[PDB]
Amino acid sequence: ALARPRPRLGDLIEISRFGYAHWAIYVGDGYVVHLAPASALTNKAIVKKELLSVVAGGDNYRVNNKHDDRYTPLPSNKIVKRAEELVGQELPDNCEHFVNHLRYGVSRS
Residues identified as active-site: 22, 34, 95
Q: Residue 26's closest CA among 83, 71, 75, 72? A: 83
b/e string for 68-80 if b means 16 or more Cβ within 10 A? eeeeebbebeebb
CB 1 within 8 A of CB 77: no
